[PDB]
Chain A
């Protein structure tokens, strides 16, 4: 579907792949996904192409 409707690219992640023993490192690896979208959205308003995310397993 990313190919169907063009996003920039998919960045795919697995849930268990981002978990850190240290307190503050387990939330930031998430936010680094959305920053790439936040930039384009604020910059180019509301006609920007999708920044798409996929989680391999969230559960």
Chain B
């Protein structure tokens, strides 16, 4: 031999990102954490009143 090979290689990016907006789905599921608590919080105390 008396052989040195030092090499590099390249990447294939994974799928599932047609557009970044997809993470806005998380902004949705934030909102259905946002839009859920006050329903019961006023529901049970609406039963109280």
Contacts and interface: CB of A to CB of B under 8 A. Distances in A.
Contacts of B19: none
Interface majority SS (helix, strand, loop, mixed), chain B: loop
Contacts of A21: 1, 3, 5
Contacts of A23: 4-6
Interface in A10-59: 21-23
A14 to B, nearest CB: 19
Contacts of B1: 21
B8 to A, nearest CB: 12
A46 B17 CA distance: 52
Contacts of A22: 5, 7
Interface of A: 21-23
